[PDB]
């Protein structure tokens, strides 16, 4: 973006990453790096030590702290002290944390300069006009019976994998695929992500998937018309490149993370179809009824309703019974799924060695 949007020559720019560690030789210029690279208290390499000495010994005129919500962390806090910068700008979309350290940014960076009105930007077509919703999935009798007499960690996976949520997600995928929408399905539980993807026959992307496979699946999602739904874990929440999507389903979530909830919404906020009249993107938060998932979903949606979004509940989907194939419609299939979820949890001496 620096090389594209402005008249900055590439010899004035430099990158401080694992692969790239050479610096610009001019008297001034740009360096771009990672928070973990600058704030690495571990034994860094010699070349990285030299580059960090160059960064610390140079008086910088401007620092840009992209995704400034992670600055109040333990030693991510120290990047504003290890770097002597005159001007500090923090750029973010999710200025919330689940602890009280979000208020420490005025001591770290400075006062909140500008709050963007999200609805003013949506009504002017700058961002997509999403239709936020919250589908209530009634938990089945046997799953809820197992849900009450369990610990919280097992309760988590047990309310994520309820078969009514399977049916609701399958119906929503089918309906929005008939509408020709690019759908990104989010679920932080890796096992649930894999199970939903295998049940619905859609590709899934998470942490241990190879990067070339991730790129191939992203290209297929962006271009192949038969690939309109990709399942994503918490990899999609953080700042990675994604194709434009117009529908979103949140199967599971990481507690009441408002930052993650607003980060997931941002992946459908920049769709190309904003210029089309009457276009709306769709946000769905599939949550299981009468569980702690209501509590965590409300805690997550607190930030979005603070922005002004209206989360309309959906306790009924028209056409659930009329869909051809229902995931775990039969009681025996649901019982098998219940059992599966429960069972989830001297050079010559060197020839010796």
């Amino acid at each position: 973006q620096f090389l594209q949007w402005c008249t900055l020559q590439p010899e004035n720019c430099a990158v401080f990453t694992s692969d790239n560690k050479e610096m610009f030789q001019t008297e001034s210029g740009l360096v771009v790096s990672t928070y973990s690279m600058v704030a690495n208290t571990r034994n860094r390499s010699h070349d990285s030590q030299k580059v960090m000495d160059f960064l610390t010994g140079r008086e910088w005129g401007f620092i840009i702290l992209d995704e400034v919500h992670v600055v109040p962390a333990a030693m991510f806090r120290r990047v504003v002290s290890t770097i002597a910068a005159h001007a500090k700008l923090g750029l973010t979309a999710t200025l919330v944390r689940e602890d009280d350290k979000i208020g420490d940014l005025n001591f770290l960076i400075g006062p909140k300069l500008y709050e963007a009105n999200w609805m003013e930007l949506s009504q002017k077509g700058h961002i997509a006009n999403v239709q936020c919703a919250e589908v209530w999935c009634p938990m089945t009798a046997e799953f809820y019976q197992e849900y009450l007499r369990e610990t919280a960690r097992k309760r988590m996976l047990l309310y994520i994998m309820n078969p009514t949520k399977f049916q609701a997600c399958q119906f929503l995928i089918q309906y929005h695929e008939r509408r020709g929408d690019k759908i990104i399905v989010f679920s932080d539980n890796v096992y649930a992500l894999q199970e939903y993807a295998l049940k619905m026959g859609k590709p899934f992307i998470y942490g241990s998937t190879p990067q070339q496979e991730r790129m191939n699946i992203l290209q297929n999602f962006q271009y192949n018309d038969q690939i309109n739904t990709i399942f994503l874990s918490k990899v999609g929440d953080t700042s990675i490149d994604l194709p434009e999507a117009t529908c979103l389903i949140q199967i599971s979530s990481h507690y009441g993370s408002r930052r993650q909830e607003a980060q997931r919404l941002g992946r459908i906020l920049r769709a190309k179809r904003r210029n089309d009249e009457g276009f709306n993107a769709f946000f769905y938060s599939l949550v299981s009824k009468d569980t702690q998932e209501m509590y965590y979903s409300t805690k997550r949606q607190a930030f979005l309703v603070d922005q002004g979004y209206a989360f309309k509940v959906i306790t009924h989907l028209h056409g659930m019974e009329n869909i051809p194939n229902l995931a775990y419609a039969s009681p025996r299939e649901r019982r098998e799924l219940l059992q599966e979820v429960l069972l989830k949890n001297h050079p010559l001496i060197r020839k010796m060695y």
Binding site: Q167, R179, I314
Partner: protein, 304 residues
């Protein structure tokens, strides 16, 4: 074809007709007619022998009128040989012709300048020339005759200057004969010559014989470092149907952006989700008739 190509063809034709024999003329005209030839090509067209074309190929290679290509191919009988392809490089050939004629006229001018020098002398016994400068150092005590250094013979006069007018007239008779060549170079110097090569010469190729072992298809190598238009004719009757089909496409576009039923209205009150004209025309035609009476092996495949 190209008029400049006609000019270079006429220039090579004139130089081979003037400064070369008939066999050279046949070879160069074969190349100028059939653009690229091999040995068997020229042999079949001219009924010439391999040693007979020897001096011809050697002279037109040394004088750069014909270039050679050392491509070997793979015929289906697998009895391949490293055949040679004879063709012409037009700019190199015309530069060689220009250099040759310029050196010819410069050498003739220098010979004319040497003939402008006085006659000098030459001793017939020893057959050695003696310039006028060295004659004075070899004159007799009588100051009457120039005597040889070795033969001691009275020097006789050479003919350096008597033939000077003859050499000038030879230059004049060369100049009007070479005048079409310089006219062709005048027209070429006012134009742009495309630097042809082996690939370029194959574009205007005409094959000479059917069973030619020389496959003119070129084989590039690695390591050597030396659209369609379609129309919709309508009689303005089906175009209304086309507009209706575009309206149907617009309706499909409206259905694509339709709001879902669980978004436009509340779902709380609903249940929870879970598991005869023809004879008329005949009568009018009969009435019109009554009125008228009243007035009365497989390979790669491509979709092209």
């Amino acid at each position: 074809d190209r008029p400049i190509d006609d000019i270079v063809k006429n220039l090579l034709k004139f130089v081979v007709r003037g400064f070369y024999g008939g066999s050279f003329v046949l070879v160069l005209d074969a190349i100028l007619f059939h653009s690229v030839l091999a040995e068997d090509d020229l042999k079949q067209l001219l009924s010439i022998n391999k040693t007979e074309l020897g001096p011809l190929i050697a002279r037109l290679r040394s004088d750069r009128l014909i270039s050679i290509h050392k491509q070997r191919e793979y015929p289906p009988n697998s009895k391949s040989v490293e055949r040679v392809y004879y063709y012409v490089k037009y700019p190199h050939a015309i530069d060689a012709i220009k250099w040759k004629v310029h050196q010819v006229v410069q050498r003739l001018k220098d010979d004319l300048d040497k003939n402008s020098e006085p006659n000098g002398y030459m001793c017939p016994i020893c057959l050695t020339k003696y310039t006028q400068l060295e004659a004075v150092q070899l004159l007799n005590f009588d100051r009457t005759e120039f005597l040889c250094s070795l033969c001691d013979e009275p020097l006789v006069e050479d003919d350096s200057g008597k033939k000077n007018k003859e050499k000038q007239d030879k230059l004049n008779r060369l100049m009007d004969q070479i005048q079409p060549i310089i006219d062709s170079l005048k027209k070429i110097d006012d134009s742009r010559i495309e630097e042809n090569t082996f690939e370029i010469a194959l574009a205007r190729l005409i094959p000479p014989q059917n069973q030619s072992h020389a496959a003119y298809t070129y084989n590039p190598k690695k390591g050597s470092t030396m659209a369609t238009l379609h129309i919709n004719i309508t009689t303005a009757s089906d175009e209304v149907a086309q507009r209706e089909l575009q309206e149907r496409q617009a309706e499909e576009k409206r259905k694509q952006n339709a709001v879902p039923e669980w978004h436009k209205q509340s779902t709380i009150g609903k249940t929870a989700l879970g598991r005869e004209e023809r004879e008329n025309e005949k009568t009018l035609n009969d009435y019109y008739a009554a009125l008228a009476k009243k007035q009365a092996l497989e390979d790669e495949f491509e979709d092209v």
